[PDB]
Design a binder for this molecule. Structure first.
Ligand SMILES: [Cl-]
Ligand SMILES: [Cl-]
Ligand SMILES: [K+]
Ligand SMILES: [Mg+2]
Ligand SMILES: [Mg+2]
Ligand SMILES: [Mg+2]
Ligand SMILES: [Mg+2]
Ligand SMILES: [Mg+2]
Ligand SMILES: [Mg+2]
Ligand SMILES: [Mg+2]
Ligand SMILES: [Mg+2]
Ligand SMILES: [Mg+2]
Ligand SMILES: [Mg+2]
Ligand code: NA
Ligand code: NA
Ligand code: NA
Ligand code: NA
Ligand code: NA
Ligand code: NA
Ligand code: NA
Ligand code: NA
Ligand code: NA
Ligand code: NA
Ligand code: NA
Ligand code: NA
Ligand code: NA
Ligand SMILES: [Sr+2]
Ligand SMILES: [Sr+2]
Ligand SMILES: [Sr+2]
Ligand SMILES: [Sr+2]
Ligand SMILES: [Sr+2]
Ligand SMILES: [Sr+2]
Ligand SMILES: [Sr+2]
Ligand SMILES: [Sr+2]
Lengths: 56, 65, 81, 194, 46
RNA sequence: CGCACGGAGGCGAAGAACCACAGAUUUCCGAAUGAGAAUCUCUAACAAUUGCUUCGCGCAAUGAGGAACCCCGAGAACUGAAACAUCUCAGUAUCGGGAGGAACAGAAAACGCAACGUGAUGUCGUUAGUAACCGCGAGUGAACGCGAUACAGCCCAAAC
RNA sequence: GAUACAGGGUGACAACCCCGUACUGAAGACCAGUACGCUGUGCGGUAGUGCCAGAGUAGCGGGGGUUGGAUAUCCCUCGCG
RNA sequence: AGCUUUACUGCAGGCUGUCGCUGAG
């Protein structure tokens, strides 16, 4: 079975969903953790210095 | 417009409530006529009714009821 | 504070329920229960509510189909508004 | 004449001799069965506590903290590293154990602030320190001429910013002259070379 | 699928947003719904 | 009678619009705190950790945010050395914790132009690419002092 | 005209068409609950007195990190003191 | 760059002595 088109047919699983805390469609309903704002993982908001250039 | 602030402050606490219920009903009956597509409307009132209710409520808060 | 009844739901289907089954239809606050819809309606129009059916619509609002007792006449109640 | 306090002080100059030795050998048995942070009603070393700011007053708290002895509990590199950075065993942390203790204590009492701390011994595998914390919100303290300073907003979380006594020493600020070129006014302002 | 009450409210809004710029706004502004979403060609969130 | 010049209609001399200050209202999720949940739901709530305590959540505290700045911890590699290991990149990038409107520092167990001298601390200019480090290779790199800015000096522990 | 010839608008190039601009004045915010002033307290000096003055510290050794710090940086850790 | 080994240099880990915990005859 090809890893391409033929394997795309089984993708009918819902994982990332609208997040209660940030509004982005990143709340993983299986993990119950938002990949965008960290909701479900930390009280503090997910953020990293690498999200922008070092001198900015 | 028709209902001024003085007039509201001159009302008794019980008169504002009665007046409130009166206004809420004119409002509900207007929104009903609107829902039925009824055009015998006068767009200014449905808009005025909302402000009147806001005023009365503001005064009720101000006067302690 | 939110009110229970928003406005009468007037559509062809609503009329049939009114003429043929003595029912009134309303757009009501989606936080309202059948019991709250029942009371609010009796108090606003002074009638006796026999049964209430509800639905959360694809319009974001809640629709309530309220049947009145044989003592009251839907057409008449609706006609005064 | 000698104050009674001087006697407690003198006993602790040699915690391995005399009565104090027997005391410790007894206490530690109980301490080892206590938690990480135990609030205690009275300082084990009264002279030291009073000397550091302690007062038998409302809003003054004392807690004994135990921390493991030894070097850094470090994980070995999981990616490329030049030989100089491949060490694990001989690496030690830059914060002394007493400072770690002060921090664990302050976390336990989120509303309090670390005033100071001191050692109360150790066994083969751990060390104990008693930390003095102050309630910056209690009026008994807000009205105290000797302690109300700790109530200011800029004194919030002082332990976590190294404003503690053990913090300032560990930061190399003891000396005002030679040797403190890269420590004063801060390690960070000096490029972290202290 | 089974939609919750909240999911339903959201789908509802998306449908409403999918209407056109009223006729009068064209006149009033003397002369586009940049958010016209098709159920098939597009994809909503969740 | 917003952007926004439509239609209908309305508001304003009972002084509206509009602007300033102050106040009212301020759904749900959210640190999110009664419990659970993809913004809803279930049967009275400072959840959790603490201080005081009338030992009752009665009175209080913490939590999260913010452009960067600031303080305390953890800490690479590409690269340079025309290879490379110490060295260098660099205590940099990135990570953990935390404060403020600025932080931090700070009234000498100092300095050591050695003196019959200076006199808390930052910072700026300079001292100086000097002293010092270094496969003594490549590279790395201060301080005292001086000229400035601004200036401010005090409180405990103990004795009694 | 000008203590106003900055700038903008206005059917084409504007000191004098309109807003502004000079001059004068007003309010808020910051400086700052600071300076000044004041209330209270009481500074200081002689003589005598070994009454007091911060310990795992000062310091030493083993192992590391860090620094220009070289025998002579700062810090951590284990032991001694 | 992946891999190998009696390539160079190091780093975990194991074994072992010693110091601390650690005391009485
Ligand atoms: Cl603290
Ligand atoms: Cl000098
Ligand atoms: K390298
Ligand atoms: Mg149903
Ligand atoms: Mg600084
Ligand atoms: Mg449609
Ligand atoms: Mg909750
Ligand atoms: Mg090279
Ligand atoms: Mg070479
Ligand atoms: Mg360097
Ligand atoms: Mg010097
Ligand atoms: Mg280095
Ligand atoms: Mg290769
Ligand atoms: Na509706
Ligand atoms: Na704390
Ligand atoms: Na689709
Ligand atoms: Na508001
Ligand atoms: Na609280
Ligand atoms: Na309580
Ligand atoms: Na090269
Ligand atoms: Na190479
Ligand atoms: Na070298
Ligand atoms: Na000179
Ligand atoms: Na250093
Ligand atoms: Na050492
Ligand atoms: Na390869
Ligand atoms: Sr599937
Ligand atoms: Sr979690
Ligand atoms: Sr972050
Ligand atoms: Sr519809
Ligand atoms: Sr905090
Ligand atoms: Sr498709
Ligand atoms: Sr001065
Ligand atoms: Sr002293």
């Amino acid at each position: 079975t090809g890893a391409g088109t033929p394997s795309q047919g089984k993708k009918n699983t819902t994982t990332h969903t609208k997040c209660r805390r940030c509004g982005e469609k990143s709340y993983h309903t299986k993990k119950k953790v938002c990949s965008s704002c960290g909701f479900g993982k930390s009280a503090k908001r997910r953020d990293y210095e690498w999200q922008s250039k070092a001198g900015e | 417009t028709v209902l001024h602030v003085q007039e509201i402050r001159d009302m008794t606490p019980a008169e504002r409530e009665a007046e409130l219920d009166d206004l809420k009903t004119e409002l509900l009956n207007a929104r009903a006529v609107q829902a039925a597509g009824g055009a015998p409307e006068n767009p200014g009132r449905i808009k005025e009714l909302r402000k009147a209710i806001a005023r009365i409520k503001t005064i009720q808060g101000e006067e302690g009821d | 504070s939110w009110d229970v009844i928003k406005h009468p739901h007037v559509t062809e289907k609503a009329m049939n329920d009114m003429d043929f089954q003595n029912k009134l239809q309303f757009a009501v606050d989606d936080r309202a229960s059948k019991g709250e819809v029942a009371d609010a309606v009796e108090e606003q129009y002074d009638v006796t509510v026999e049964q209430v059916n509800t639905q959360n619509t694809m319009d974001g609002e809640k629709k309530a189909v309220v049947r009145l007792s044989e003592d009251d006449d839907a057409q008449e109640v609706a006609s005064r508004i | 004449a000698r104050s009674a306090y001087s006697y407690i002080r003198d006993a602790w100059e040699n915690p391995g001799d005399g009565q104090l030795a027997e005391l410790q050998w007894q206490r530690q048995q109980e301490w080892r069965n206590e938690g990480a942070v135990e609030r205690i009603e009275r300082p084990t070393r009264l002279d030291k506590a009073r000397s550091q700011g302690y007062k038998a007053k409302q809003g003054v708290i004392v807690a004994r903290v135990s921390v493991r002895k030894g070097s850094a509990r470090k994980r070995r590199h999981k990616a490329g590293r030049r030989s100089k950075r491949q060490g694990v065993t001989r690496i030690t942390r830059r914060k002394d154990i007493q400072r770690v203790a002060e921090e664990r204590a302050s976390r336990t009492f989120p509303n309090l602030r670390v005033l100071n701390s001191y050692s109360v011994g150790q066994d083969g595998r751990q060390k104990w320190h008693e930390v003095i914390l102050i309630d910056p919100n209690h009026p008994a303290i807000q009205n105290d001429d000797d302690l109300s300073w700790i109530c200011a907003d800029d004194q919030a979380d002082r332990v976590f910013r190294g404003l503690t006594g053990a913090g300032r020493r560990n930061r190399g600020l003891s000396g005002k002259g030679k040797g403190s070129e890269k420590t004063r006014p801060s390690l960070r302002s000096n490029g972290g070379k202290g | 699928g089974k939609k919750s009450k909240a999911t339903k409210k959201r789908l509802a809004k998306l449908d409403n947003q999918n209407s056109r710029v009223p006729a009068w706004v064209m006149l009033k502004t003397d002369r586009r719904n940049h958010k016209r979403r098709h159920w098939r060609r597009n994809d909503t969130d969740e």
